[PDB]
Design a protein around this motif. Structure first.
Motif, PDB file in Angstrom:
ATOM      1  N   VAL A  26       0.823  -1.202   0.000  1.00  7.65           N
ATOM      2  CA  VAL A  26       0.000   0.000   0.000  1.00  7.65           C
ATOM      3  C   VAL A  26       0.862   1.260   0.000  1.00  7.65           C
ATOM      4  O   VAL A  26       0.691   2.140  -0.843  1.00  7.65           O
ATOM      5  N   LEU A  27       1.786   1.338   0.950  1.00  8.31           N
ATOM      6  CA  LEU A  27       2.674   2.490   1.060  1.00  8.31           C
ATOM      7  C   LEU A  27       3.577   2.604  -0.164  1.00  8.31           C
ATOM      8  O   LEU A  27       3.985   3.701  -0.546  1.00  8.31           O
ATOM      9  N   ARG A  28       3.888   1.465  -0.774  1.00  6.84           N
ATOM     10  CA  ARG A  28       4.743   1.438  -1.955  1.00  6.84           C
ATOM     11  C   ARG A  28       4.151   2.281  -3.080  1.00  6.84           C
ATOM     12  O   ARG A  28       4.879   2.836  -3.903  1.00  6.84           O
ATOM     13  N   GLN A  29       2.825   2.372  -3.111  1.00  6.82           N
ATOM     14  CA  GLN A  29       2.135   3.147  -4.137  1.00  6.82           C
ATOM     15  C   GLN A  29       2.118   4.630  -3.784  1.00  6.82           C
ATOM     16  O   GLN A  29       2.122   5.488  -4.666  1.00  6.82           O
ATOM     17  N   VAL A  30       2.100   4.926  -2.487  1.00  8.45           N
ATOM     18  CA  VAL A  30       2.082   6.308  -2.022  1.00  8.45           C
ATOM     19  C   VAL A  30       3.489   6.893  -1.974  1.00  8.45           C
ATOM     20  O   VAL A  30       3.690   8.075  -2.253  1.00  8.45           O
ATOM     21  N   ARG A  31       4.460   6.060  -1.617  1.00  4.77           N
ATOM     22  CA  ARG A  31       5.849   6.494  -1.532  1.00  4.77           C
ATOM     23  C   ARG A  31       6.342   7.018  -2.878  1.00  4.77           C
ATOM     24  O   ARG A  31       7.209   7.889  -2.936  1.00  4.77           O
ATOM     25  N   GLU A  63       2.299   8.462   6.136  1.00  4.21           N
ATOM     26  CA  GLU A  63       2.602   7.143   5.591  1.00  4.21           C
ATOM     27  C   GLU A  63       2.599   6.086   6.692  1.00  4.21           C
ATOM     28  O   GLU A  63       1.987   5.028   6.547  1.00  4.21           O
ATOM     29  N   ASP A  64       3.285   6.382   7.790  1.00  2.00           N
ATOM     30  CA  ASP A  64       3.361   5.459   8.916  1.00  2.00           C
ATOM     31  C   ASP A  64       1.987   5.261   9.550  1.00  2.00           C
ATOM     32  O   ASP A  64       1.683   4.189  10.075  1.00  2.00           O
ATOM     33  N   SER A  87     -10.984   0.187   0.513  1.00  2.00           N
ATOM     34  CA  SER A  87     -11.067   1.637   0.659  1.00  2.00           C
ATOM     35  C   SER A  87      -9.856   2.317   0.029  1.00  2.00           C
ATOM     36  O   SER A  87      -9.984   3.352  -0.624  1.00  2.00           O
ATOM     37  N   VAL A  88      -8.682   1.729   0.231  1.00  2.00           N
ATOM     38  CA  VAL A  88      -7.448   2.281  -0.316  1.00  2.00           C
ATOM     39  C   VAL A  88      -7.510   2.366  -1.837  1.00  2.00           C
ATOM     40  O   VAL A  88      -6.944   3.274  -2.443  1.00  2.00           O
ATOM     41  N   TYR A  89      -8.203   1.411  -2.450  1.00  2.00           N
ATOM     42  CA  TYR A  89      -8.339   1.377  -3.901  1.00  2.00           C
ATOM     43  C   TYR A  89      -9.596   2.116  -4.349  1.00  2.00           C
ATOM     44  O   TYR A  89      -9.638   2.688  -5.438  1.00  2.00           O
ATOM     45  N   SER A  90     -10.620   2.099  -3.500  1.00  2.00           N
ATOM     46  CA  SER A  90     -11.878   2.767  -3.810  1.00  2.00           C
ATOM     47  C   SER A  90     -11.747   4.279  -3.652  1.00  2.00           C
ATOM     48  O   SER A  90     -12.405   5.046  -4.355  1.00  2.00           O
ATOM     49  N   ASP A  94      -6.233   6.295  -8.545  1.00  2.00           N
ATOM     50  CA  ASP A  94      -5.022   6.658  -9.275  1.00  2.00           C
ATOM     51  C   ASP A  94      -3.907   5.649  -9.018  1.00  2.00           C
ATOM     52  O   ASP A  94      -3.064   5.409  -9.882  1.00  2.00           O
ATOM     53  N   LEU A  95      -3.909   5.063  -7.826  1.00  2.00           N
ATOM     54  CA  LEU A  95      -2.896   4.081  -7.456  1.00  2.00           C
ATOM     55  C   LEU A  95      -2.928   2.884  -8.402  1.00  2.00           C
ATOM     56  O   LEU A  95      -1.896   2.281  -8.692  1.00  2.00           O
ATOM     57  N   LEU A  96      -4.122   2.546  -8.879  1.00  2.00           N
ATOM     58  CA  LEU A  96      -4.290   1.422  -9.793  1.00  2.00           C
ATOM     59  C   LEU A  96      -4.492   1.912 -11.224  1.00  2.00           C
ATOM     60  O   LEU A  96      -4.903   3.050 -11.450  1.00  2.00           O
ATOM     61  N   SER A  97      -4.197   1.045 -12.188  1.00  2.00           N
ATOM     62  CA  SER A  97      -4.346   1.388 -13.597  1.00  2.00           C
ATOM     63  C   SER A  97      -5.454   0.565 -14.244  1.00  2.00           C
ATOM     64  O   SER A  97      -5.359   0.184 -15.411  1.00  2.00           O
ATOM     65  N   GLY A  98      -6.507   0.293 -13.479  1.00  2.00           N
ATOM     66  CA  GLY A  98      -7.619  -0.483 -13.996  1.00  2.00           C
ATOM     67  C   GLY A  98      -7.834  -1.774 -13.227  1.00  2.00           C
ATOM     68  O   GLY A  98      -7.170  -2.775 -13.499  1.00  2.00           O
ATOM     69  N   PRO A  99      -8.761  -1.786 -12.253  1.00  2.00           N
ATOM     70  CA  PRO A  99      -9.048  -2.980 -11.451  1.00  2.00           C
ATOM     71  C   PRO A  99      -9.289  -4.214 -12.313  1.00  2.00           C
ATOM     72  O   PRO A  99      -9.078  -5.344 -11.869  1.00  2.00           O
ATOM     73  N   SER A 100      -9.730  -3.993 -13.548  1.00  2.00           N
ATOM     74  CA  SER A 100      -9.998  -5.089 -14.472  1.00  2.00           C
ATOM     75  C   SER A 100     -11.091  -6.006 -13.928  1.00  2.00           C
ATOM     76  O   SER A 100     -11.298  -6.089 -12.718  1.00  2.00           O
TER      77      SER A 100
END
Length: 102
Positions: A26-31, A63-64, A87-90, A94-100
């Protein structure tokens, strides 16, 4: 542990609903590309308790802070865990490029 993983058992090895591994993804996407992490807490603020918020309030960083939100809900249950991971994805599409779909 338990001898017979198939029916119903809590914590397979190092967790069940949420683990430290997922917390990093999760943080990897925000970092990489930060923006905001309020909607994620504003929605979890309800699922969490007043006493639980104290443990997270201690963490000033944003982040922490997210790492703590998963530690609490991760043990709460699946009804809340699914909401957090979703929730993080909902909230942050932008973090995702298409839930597919498939």
């Amino acid at each position: 542990g338990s001898s017979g993983s198939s029916g119903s058992s809590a914590l397979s090895r190092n967790g069940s609903f949420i683990t430290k591994e997922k917390k990093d993804t999760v943080l990897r996407q925000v970092r990489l590309d930060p923006c905001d992490l309020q909607p994620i807490f504003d929605d979890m603020l309800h699922f969490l308790n007043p006493e639980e918020l104290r443990v997270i309030e201690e963490i000033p960083q944003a982040e922490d802070k997210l790492d703590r939100l998963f530690e609490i809900i991760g043990v709460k249950s699946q009804e809340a865990s699914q909401t957090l991971l979703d929730s993080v994805y909902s909230h942050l599409p932008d973090l995702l490029s298409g839930p597919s779909s498939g």
